Write an enzyme that holds these catalytic residues in place. Sequence first.
Site, PDB file in Angstrom:
ATOM      1  N   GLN A   1       0.758  -1.256   0.000  1.00 46.77           N
ATOM      2  CA  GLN A   1       0.000   0.000   0.000  1.00 46.77           C
ATOM      3  C   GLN A   1       0.786   1.303   0.000  1.00 46.77           C
ATOM      4  OE1 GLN A   1      -3.312  -1.806   2.700  1.00 46.77           O
ATOM      5  NE2 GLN A   1      -3.806   0.327   2.255  1.00 46.77           N
TER       6      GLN A   1
ATOM      7  N   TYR B   1      13.234 -20.613  45.318  1.00 53.97           N
ATOM      8  CA  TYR B   1      12.639 -21.902  44.940  1.00 53.97           C
ATOM      9  C   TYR B   1      13.247 -22.408  43.633  1.00 53.97           C
ATOM     10  CZ  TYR B   1       8.715 -21.959  48.349  1.00 53.97           C
ATOM     11  OH  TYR B   1       7.919 -21.979  49.481  1.00 53.97           O
TER      12      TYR B   1
ATOM     13  N   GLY C   1       1.416 -26.810  50.812  1.00 56.09           N
ATOM     14  CA  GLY C   1       0.758 -27.529  49.729  1.00 56.09           C
ATOM     15  C   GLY C   1       1.671 -28.047  48.637  1.00 56.09           C
TER      16      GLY C   1
ATOM     17  N   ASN D   1       1.761 -25.541  41.796  1.00 60.10           N
ATOM     18  CA  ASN D   1       2.815 -25.477  42.810  1.00 60.10           C
ATOM     19  C   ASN D   1       4.276 -25.420  42.347  1.00 60.10           C
ATOM     20  OD1 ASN D   1       0.527 -27.748  44.120  1.00 60.10           O
ATOM     21  ND2 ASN D   1       0.793 -25.690  44.978  1.00 60.10           N
TER      22      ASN D   1
HETATM   23  C1  F43 Z   1      -3.502  -6.412   0.852  1.00 59.58           C
HETATM   24  C2  F43 Z   1      -4.779  -5.788   1.414  1.00 59.58           C
HETATM   25  C3  F43 Z   1      -5.775  -6.913   1.624  1.00 59.58           C
HETATM   26  C4  F43 Z   1      -5.687  -7.110   3.117  1.00 59.58           C
HETATM   27  O1  F43 Z   1      -6.064  -8.132   3.659  1.00 59.58           O
HETATM   28  N1  F43 Z   1      -5.145  -6.050   3.717  1.00 59.58           N
HETATM   29  C5  F43 Z   1      -4.565  -5.107   2.769  1.00 59.58           C
HETATM   30  C6  F43 Z   1      -3.105  -4.820   3.100  1.00 59.58           C
HETATM   31  C7  F43 Z   1      -3.019  -4.565   4.602  1.00 59.58           C
HETATM   32  C8  F43 Z   1      -1.615  -4.266   5.163  1.00 59.58           C
HETATM   33  C9  F43 Z   1      -0.742  -3.407   4.233  1.00 59.58           C
HETATM   34  C10 F43 Z   1       0.764  -3.538   4.514  1.00 59.58           C
HETATM   35  C11 F43 Z   1       1.653  -3.351   3.309  1.00 59.58           C
HETATM   36  O2  F43 Z   1       1.252  -2.713   2.306  1.00 59.58           O
HETATM   37  O3  F43 Z   1       2.787  -3.862   3.379  1.00 59.58           O
HETATM   38  C12 F43 Z   1      -1.973  -3.629   6.510  1.00 59.58           C
HETATM   39  C13 F43 Z   1      -1.057  -2.518   7.017  1.00 59.58           C
HETATM   40  C14 F43 Z   1      -2.125  -4.696   7.602  1.00 59.58           C
HETATM   41  C15 F43 Z   1      -0.789  -5.333   7.959  1.00 59.58           C
HETATM   42  N2  F43 Z   1      -0.500  -6.424   7.398  1.00 59.58           N
HETATM   43  O4  F43 Z   1      -0.024  -4.817   8.755  1.00 59.58           O
HETATM   44  C16 F43 Z   1      -3.295  -2.984   6.163  1.00 59.58           C
HETATM   45  N3  F43 Z   1      -3.753  -3.359   5.041  1.00 59.58           N
HETATM   46 NI1  F43 Z   1      -5.243  -2.330   4.060  1.00 59.58          NI
HETATM   47  N4  F43 Z   1      -4.932  -0.687   5.226  1.00 59.58           N
HETATM   48  C17 F43 Z   1      -5.563   0.491   5.139  1.00 59.58           C
HETATM   49  C18 F43 Z   1      -6.573   0.819   4.320  1.00 59.58           C
HETATM   50  C19 F43 Z   1      -6.892   0.088   3.224  1.00 59.58           C
HETATM   51  C20 F43 Z   1      -7.723   0.622   2.074  1.00 59.58           C
HETATM   52  C21 F43 Z   1      -6.950   1.658   1.262  1.00 59.58           C
HETATM   53  C22 F43 Z   1      -7.822   2.304   0.188  1.00 59.58           C
HETATM   54  C23 F43 Z   1      -7.066   3.386  -0.558  1.00 59.58           C
HETATM   55  O5  F43 Z   1      -7.657   4.018  -1.467  1.00 59.58           O
HETATM   56  O6  F43 Z   1      -5.874   3.619  -0.258  1.00 59.58           O
HETATM   57  C24 F43 Z   1      -8.062  -0.612   1.269  1.00 59.58           C
HETATM   58  C25 F43 Z   1      -9.465  -1.126   1.570  1.00 59.58           C
HETATM   59  C26 F43 Z   1     -10.520  -0.287   0.894  1.00 59.58           C
HETATM   60  O7  F43 Z   1     -10.412  -0.082  -0.336  1.00 59.58           O
HETATM   61  O8  F43 Z   1     -11.470   0.168   1.579  1.00 59.58           O
HETATM   62  C27 F43 Z   1      -7.116  -1.600   1.846  1.00 59.58           C
HETATM   63  C28 F43 Z   1      -6.965  -2.795   1.276  1.00 59.58           C
HETATM   64  C29 F43 Z   1      -5.883  -3.749   1.564  1.00 59.58           C
HETATM   65  N5  F43 Z   1      -5.307  -3.850   2.682  1.00 59.58           N
HETATM   66  C30 F43 Z   1      -5.359  -4.707   0.530  1.00 59.58           C
HETATM   67  C31 F43 Z   1      -4.300  -4.038  -0.342  1.00 59.58           C
HETATM   68  C32 F43 Z   1      -4.883  -2.984  -1.289  1.00 59.58           C
HETATM   69  C33 F43 Z   1      -3.824  -2.512  -2.260  1.00 59.58           C
HETATM   70  O9  F43 Z   1      -3.404  -3.321  -3.110  1.00 59.58           O
HETATM   71  O10 F43 Z   1      -3.399  -1.336  -2.182  1.00 59.58           O
HETATM   72  N6  F43 Z   1      -6.524  -1.182   2.969  1.00 59.58           N
HETATM   73  C34 F43 Z   1      -7.297   2.078   4.662  1.00 59.58           C
HETATM   74  O11 F43 Z   1      -8.415   2.364   4.252  1.00 59.58           O
HETATM   75  C35 F43 Z   1      -6.664   3.102   5.578  1.00 59.58           C
HETATM   76  C36 F43 Z   1      -5.989   2.373   6.731  1.00 59.58           C
HETATM   77  C37 F43 Z   1      -4.945   1.477   6.094  1.00 59.58           C
HETATM   78  C38 F43 Z   1      -4.189   0.599   7.071  1.00 59.58           C
HETATM   79  C39 F43 Z   1      -2.903   1.249   7.584  1.00 59.58           C
HETATM   80  C40 F43 Z   1      -3.110   2.261   8.698  1.00 59.58           C
HETATM   81  O12 F43 Z   1      -4.183   2.283   9.345  1.00 59.58           O
HETATM   82  O13 F43 Z   1      -2.172   3.051   8.950  1.00 59.58           O
HETATM   83  C41 F43 Z   1      -3.890  -0.661   6.254  1.00 59.58           C
HETATM   84  C42 F43 Z   1      -4.011  -1.970   7.025  1.00 59.58           C
HETATM   85  C1  LIG Z   2      -5.811 -21.748  42.862  1.00 58.37           C
HETATM   86  C2  LIG Z   2      -6.162 -20.600  41.918  1.00 58.37           C
HETATM   87  O1  LIG Z   2      -6.540 -19.464  42.697  1.00 58.37           O
HETATM   88  P1  LIG Z   2      -8.092 -19.153  43.015  1.00 58.37           P
HETATM   89  O2  LIG Z   2      -8.548 -20.281  43.914  1.00 58.37           O
HETATM   90  O3  LIG Z   2      -8.758 -19.164  41.659  1.00 58.37           O
HETATM   91  O4  LIG Z   2      -8.024 -17.795  43.684  1.00 58.37           O
HETATM   92  C3  LIG Z   2      -4.992 -20.209  41.014  1.00 58.37           C
HETATM   93  N1  LIG Z   2      -3.838 -19.848  41.821  1.00 58.37           N
HETATM   94  C4  LIG Z   2      -2.742 -20.611  41.860  1.00 58.37           C
HETATM   95  O5  LIG Z   2      -2.748 -21.786  41.531  1.00 58.37           O
HETATM   96  C5  LIG Z   2      -1.463 -19.958  42.338  1.00 58.37           C
HETATM   97  C6  LIG Z   2      -0.271 -20.689  41.724  1.00 58.37           C
HETATM   98  C7  LIG Z   2       1.072 -20.035  42.054  1.00 58.37           C
HETATM   99  C8  LIG Z   2       1.165 -19.621  43.522  1.00 58.37           C
HETATM  100  C9  LIG Z   2       1.400 -20.836  44.417  1.00 58.37           C
HETATM  101  C10 LIG Z   2       2.715 -21.532  44.063  1.00 58.37           C
HETATM  102  S1  LIG Z   2       2.982 -22.867  45.254  1.00 58.37           S
HETATM  103  C11 LIG Z   2      -5.413 -19.072  40.111  1.00 58.37           C
HETATM  104  O6  LIG Z   2      -5.026 -17.908  40.378  1.00 58.37           O
HETATM  105  O7  LIG Z   2      -6.144 -19.319  39.123  1.00 58.37           O
HETATM  106  O1  LIG Z   3       3.553 -21.284  54.108  1.00 57.77           O
HETATM  107  S1  LIG Z   3       2.997 -21.751  52.787  1.00 57.77           S
HETATM  108  O2  LIG Z   3       3.267 -23.219  52.621  1.00 57.77           O
HETATM  109  O3  LIG Z   3       1.511 -21.468  52.924  1.00 57.77           O
HETATM  110  C1  LIG Z   3       3.649 -20.841  51.405  1.00 57.77           C
HETATM  111  C2  LIG Z   3       5.132 -21.087  51.216  1.00 57.77           C
HETATM  112  S2  LIG Z   3       5.699 -20.094  49.853  1.00 57.77           S
END
Ligand code: F43
Ligand SMILES: C[C@@H](OP(=O)(O)O)[C@H](NC(=O)CCCCCCS)C(=O)O
Ligand SMILES: O=S(=O)(O)CCS
Lengths: 548, 262, 442, 442
Positions: free
Chosen positions: A147, A332, A444, A480
């Site tokens: 683009q 640990y 635990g 754990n």
């Molecule tokens: C390859 C695609 C198909 C796809 O899946 N995404 C593309 C390309 C993708 C790439 C372009 C990167 C590059 O060129 O290397 C990125 C940046 C996404 C990425 N991969 O990071 C992007 N478009 Ni596109 N793309 C854009 C846009 C657009 C507009 C551009 C129209 C015009 O007249 O210039 C048109 C869609 C439309 O017609 O509505 C468009 C299509 C297209 N967009 C056509 C390429 C068209 C071409 O051959 O030039 N983008 C936009 O409309 C503005 C935002 C802009 C994005 C970048 C930014 O936001 O800074 C980018 C968003």
């Molecule tokens: C049990 C569970 O916590 P809740 O019962 O969901 O509050 C879980 N924590 C943990 O397992 C803590 C793991 C690391 C700290 C203990 C190491 S021995 C978690 O946050 O999802």
């Molecule tokens: O004392 S406890 O076994 O609860 C935690 C050790 S890190």
Amino acid sequence: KKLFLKALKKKFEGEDPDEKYTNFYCFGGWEQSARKKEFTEYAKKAAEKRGGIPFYNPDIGVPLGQRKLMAYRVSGTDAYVEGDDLHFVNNAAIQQMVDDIKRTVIVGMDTAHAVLEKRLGVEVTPETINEYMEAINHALPGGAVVQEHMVEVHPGLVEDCYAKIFTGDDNLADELDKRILIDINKEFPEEQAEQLKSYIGNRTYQVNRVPTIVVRTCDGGTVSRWSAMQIGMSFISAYKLCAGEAAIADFSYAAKHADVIEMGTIMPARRARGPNEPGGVAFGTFADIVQTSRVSDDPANVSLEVIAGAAALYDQVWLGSYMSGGVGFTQYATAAYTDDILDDFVYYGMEYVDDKYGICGTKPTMDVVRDISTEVTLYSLEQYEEYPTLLEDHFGGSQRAAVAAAAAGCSTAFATGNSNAGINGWYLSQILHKEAHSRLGFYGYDLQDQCGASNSLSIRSDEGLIHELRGPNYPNYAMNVGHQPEYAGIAQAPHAARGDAFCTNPLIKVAFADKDLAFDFTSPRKSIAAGALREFMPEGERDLIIPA
Amino acid sequence: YKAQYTPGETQIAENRRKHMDPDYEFRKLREVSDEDLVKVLGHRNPGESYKSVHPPLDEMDFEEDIVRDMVEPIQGAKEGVRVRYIQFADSMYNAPAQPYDRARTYMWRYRGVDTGTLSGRQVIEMRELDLEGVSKELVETELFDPATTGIRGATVHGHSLRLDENGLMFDALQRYVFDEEKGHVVYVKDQVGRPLDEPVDMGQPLGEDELKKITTIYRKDNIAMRDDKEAIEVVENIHTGRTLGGFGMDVFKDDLRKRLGD
Amino acid sequence: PMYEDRIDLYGADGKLLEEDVPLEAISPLKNPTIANLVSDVKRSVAVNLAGIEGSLRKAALGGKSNFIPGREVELPIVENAEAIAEKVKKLVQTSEDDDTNIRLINNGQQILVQVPTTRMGVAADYTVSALVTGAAVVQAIIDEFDVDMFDANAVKTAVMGRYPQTVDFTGANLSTLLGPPVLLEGLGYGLRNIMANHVVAITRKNTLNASALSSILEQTAMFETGDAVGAFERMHLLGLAYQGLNANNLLFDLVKENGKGTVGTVIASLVERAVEDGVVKVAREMNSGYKVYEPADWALWNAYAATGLLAATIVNVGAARAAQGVASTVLYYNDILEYETGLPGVDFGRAMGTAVGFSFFSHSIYGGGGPGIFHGNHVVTRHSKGFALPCVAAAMCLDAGTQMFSVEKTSGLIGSVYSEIDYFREPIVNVAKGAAEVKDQL
Amino acid sequence: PMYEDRIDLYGADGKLLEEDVPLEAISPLKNPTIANLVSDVKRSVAVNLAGIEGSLRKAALGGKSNFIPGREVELPIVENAEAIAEKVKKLVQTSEDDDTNIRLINNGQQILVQVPTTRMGVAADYTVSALVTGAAVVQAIIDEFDVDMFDANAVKTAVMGRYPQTVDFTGANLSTLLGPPVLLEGLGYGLRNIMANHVVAITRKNTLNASALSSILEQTAMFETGDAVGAFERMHLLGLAYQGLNANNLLFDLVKENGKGTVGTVIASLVERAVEDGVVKVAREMNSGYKVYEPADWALWNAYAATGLLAATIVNVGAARAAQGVASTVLYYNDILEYETGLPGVDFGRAMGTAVGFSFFSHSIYGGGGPGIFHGNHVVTRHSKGFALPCVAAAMCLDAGTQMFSVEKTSGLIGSVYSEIDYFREPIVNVAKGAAEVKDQL
Ligand code: F43
Ligand SMILES: C[C@@H](OP(=O)(O)O)[C@H](NC(=O)CCCCCCS)C(=O)O
Ligand SMILES: O=S(=O)(O)CCS
Ligand SMILES: C[C@@H](OP(=O)(O)O)[C@H](NC(=O)CCCCCCS)C(=O)O
Ligand SMILES: [K+]
């Protein structure tokens, strides 16, 4: 001579290691600690920014440092640090490990290539693939490809964001741009490379690493979506497709559903999280993320490194923050990767197994499980009994239970090549540990411990599951500390013993064999130690877009 | 039926059995007045009436429940007295009582018990009236070494630490101190750390040698777990029974056969 | 019959109800009372008319101190409860002859709505009863008072809460004993989603009827999850019979003989009875003289142990009249039982494991709460397959007022709505009736 | 009967099946065929023995390129399919006389397991059928081959996948037309969770039988969600009758008379027929001469409009023999219909809105996919209350091979297992049979 003795000697300098008596109440409390004094100074300076809101204050509640406050040696390293430096909030390396796992997604390319050829009449060659890979390394970090009047992401903020490719097809691999290739033949020893390819076939996958700043701003569930969007944009660009036609929907479906490999699965509502959050990462998946297996032939070393990484991921970050929070669960976890303590127990177990059974020398039976687990647990317990400064080190029962049972469980797995035998050994260790000391862990701790033997080899509904595929959402395990990190080790142990290239998924194993990752997954210990010393540079900082 | 209490062929196992065996009377080693006990508990003032959490049982009206009324309520529950606690740390250097040892003892010997076991502390929550009765026995007898048994409701660190220069267990709040003159352990704070107006003398520490004889923990430099093969064997038997039960296919083979039959 | 086991069914009063009954006559798959109970659990809905009226009046919509100023609606709903209830009946029924039942609760401040089984029969899951009752109450109120089109969506919001912005009925003024399946921990856990206090309120705090109701729901759930299949079926039946339904008066007699006893004395009594009945025998003697026991019948041993467990709960918690000790009791009953004998504990360690976490999460900062809010769909207490939660129900019957989150606070309205249903309130006597009705048909 | 509406039921071949039928005779609440159909959908499980054997052999466990080296198990499962199926029957049934049905598929490559309604009746939701079948298959295999205790958990994992680490049966080797309720978009959406390709496979690509099955499932779901309650009931009944069941041959005749026509000409035909039948009337003339129409009967107009919608789908997609145009067709049928008349479109705009998003997510980068993978529990196509998805089913019947995610790729196995079930495969002729069975008892 015991592997932990060096560290104990430095941690307890000038003290008789056999003496059961010592001096307390004589250190000046928190002022004995350089780190606590640093903390107190920053807290004071913070009063102004906080407009007088009270803050960190060591005089609130407990007077820390009535005993001597320990330093810890990260196992296998020369890093001696105060425990505070190992807290996940204080350690940028632990943070980056979690983010590197979170921001990674793997996507098969064969399905997309079949769409290109069968629906769109476009031919796919190594050259078009090289063009595609260049396009996505512009698009993935937030650059425009199709683009007009697109705004873009500052490249300075997303330098860690890139896409690479690997394939079981050696001929194709030979023709791809080496700059974006993960080379299986280069990264893995020859026999491991062969094993991987025997499962992968000639299939091709891309590894997309979303920007760190993105997963920090958002979440894990963002990642497969971010990946898929820019895969879509890159195919449209590199192959000159209509920018929005029916066949494009097939790319999206493949990249988001049919051909995507995620790191972790979603949680149930009570602990709701999207994909690629730590709770969804199965133990064998994490074992495969860790890369020690391909740079080491020592099964104890491979398991120990997995446990160190897993301690940081599962207990410090997942359980210590995501599922609770506050001061958290640093020690640990550190019990499982400091002072070479767990190392001693594990290497004892491995040698015992090697001499009596041989590594992978016997079928699993209850006889074998009972023999090994009992022996290793007794030995580990006697160490805490024989060395007063060791017991004062692992001062919490949970720590001691986890470390002893990990040695028991891994050793069992080393002998039998069976992870479920391994955890059955783990649970035997725990209830044996309990009878010996008339205590185990916290209030635990042994929920899963007591449920454990019966569910270890169960085949029922929510009980039976091969251990490698268990994880933090396995019901007994959902709550754990002091289990999950060690379970990752046990998941790794039989595969390390076997010399396997991977534990559960070859694609995950290959995807992290990559030097351009910030965290060094070949050695979680070394990276964590570098973070402890504040020598690790994380990704996703915002200095470029904020005032100095 | 003659209860066994626990397996094991060593004195440690026997010490555990004696703790659990209700016909074994604990040796009383010291005297602690009701007032000093209430003071250390730190819940109430000596002399005040027990406070209620709910009306007395007879002042409340219940629908008929035969099963409930077959169970005799303890005195504190009859009177609707609030629930309070006492909590100990037990040094791993042969404290005369140990955490699961305590719990098993309580559930054999006391009624209306809520007890939680942890590595660094062991707690009882009980009707305050009945708590005081129970607690007296827990501090006057051989279940209590003033040196290796700490009364502490919070900041419990110490069970795993080396003993201090006077052979007392670590207490970050120092609720007790060593009286050098008499060689006594004296409580100068209640179990949550509030300073006492009048300190409480808990007497002399037991000898190292006495603790080795009566402790309920296995230690290598005393009696090692490794020496009690009977205990280990029964632990493994419990583990094995659980494993086979969980798997189910063999122990329930006859049940499966009938489900498959005809 | 498939199994050879015969049992005597005894009432909560310790008296014989039905003699020489084949085990399967109390099976969830055969017993007609259990079938009717489960059916009623799924199709029954509580509607809080006073809640709806109050919510509308303040525009207190979506719960949790949500208020939407200017969208207030004033309606005399409770005053017209009979007219509304009759319209709800017409919209909910499938014929004038079906089993639709509407009943005024608390003089019309609340309503019990029982959706006809015909609607349940052509629905995938049980959410239909709330969903249909919800639509009926909304249209009944709008029609009865001719609510303006622009006010009408406030009535919908008052009845069903934040749905569909929320995945469930957050802040709604209707409820069902089962929560939406989208909040289930595990597959097939629907019937496990009932808090212990609800069970107690529903049974009007009668100890054994509470443990029975909890056991019936838990063990029936074990059939739904596939745990009570094949090799394991008999274990769950015997568990239901002995622990839940006081088979052969074992439960009633363990409590009777330990009225002034402890957890320890209950264990002694149980082990003795087990040796006496040939359920358990000495496998070997150890050097100390310690006898190691082994089951002669594993499923039956588990049932005996489970019965001693509930008895020990009643004895220790009943002695305290304070429910907090239930978790501790369940834990150490099993701990002491195993080391007393060398036998596996209840549910092979899973009842004990559950009690460990249950203890932790009812005495710490990390989660949980008082014992009354736990259930089988709770992450903390899901792990035992039917053998732990009945102790929790019994324990809350025995609490004399030590809890903040008491039965009345959590479950008062729930008790008023469902305790009318006789099978809910007195399951033991009515299950025995069902057993007699089918024992000869097996 | 409650409603006065009478209809003639016509077959897929355009011929009269049943004359002068009260509308309620095809109601999901009354029709015995639909009840049986819903029951079979909930209780039927497909077991993939070949998959289990293959997964075990390579330790390919948990799906998605998972392998666990060293944990392989080699078992001749398919070879012993007959013995295994008989054991599964023994474990799944509740008595020898119940409606348990086990059938070998493709010479034992798969098993169709239909769990007895007795088990369903005492379970909360439908997951019980997969859960029980899973446990039966696991135990059947372990028993048949005496699997080692340490290998047995690999069999469990092969059958039920990653559960319970995952919330569902990820990587499992058994499946059910309905997914676990924990993955539902909306409450009561169970019967909406069947992708359009499955419906086509089940009906063997016969156009009107596919749209009928889809309509039956969607509208029955609208009763489950409570949408088809009170004021709205008749709307959904007529929708089912006309759009789904070709009432009065309207659907069949619209297609026949526009066989060489456009979406526009179908609309002309439909509007003419509605005016002719007094369903719609001129409300007023505008300055141009444009006539604004009004419904004389809103529910019946919606039914007519919905029928033309399906006709337009069949004509436009049928002309292309490429299903991708279905989304566009649903959109512009409604768009053109509204500006042609000033009448509200199908489902009062919701069919059209659904089609707008459906178009987008089947032609863009952001999600969705090909038209065959959409269903009523999909975030994109959930919004119309039963009136859009039957068009998608019809469209995939007409696709001659333009799709990557075709019926064969997504749903081949589903056809083998479920398409034998007659009520599934030929719903129209059998629903009419059911209508005849109950028409006089209303
Ligand atoms: C390859 C695609 C198909 C796809 O899946 N995404 C593309 C390309 C993708 C790439 C372009 C990167 C590059 O060129 O290397 C990125 C940046 C996404 C990425 N991969 O990071 C992007 N478009 Ni596109 N793309 C854009 C846009 C657009 C507009 C551009 C129209 C015009 O007249 O210039 C048109 C869609 C439309 O017609 O509505 C468009 C299509 C297209 N967009 C056509 C390429 C068209 C071409 O051959 O030039 N983008 C936009 O409309 C503005 C935002 C802009 C994005 C970048 C930014 O936001 O800074 C980018 C968003
Ligand atoms: C049990 C569970 O916590 P809740 O019962 O969901 O509050 C879980 N924590 C943990 O397992 C803590 C793991 C690391 C700290 C203990 C190491 S021995 C978690 O946050 O999802
Ligand atoms: O004392 S406890 O076994 O609860 C935690 C050790 S890190
Ligand atoms: C449709 C659905 O995608 P799937 O069809 O499930 O792949 C959903 N995406 C979206 O809704 C994309 C929303 C943001 C991009 C479009 C902005 S117009 C999602 O990722 O869960
Ligand atoms: K402090």
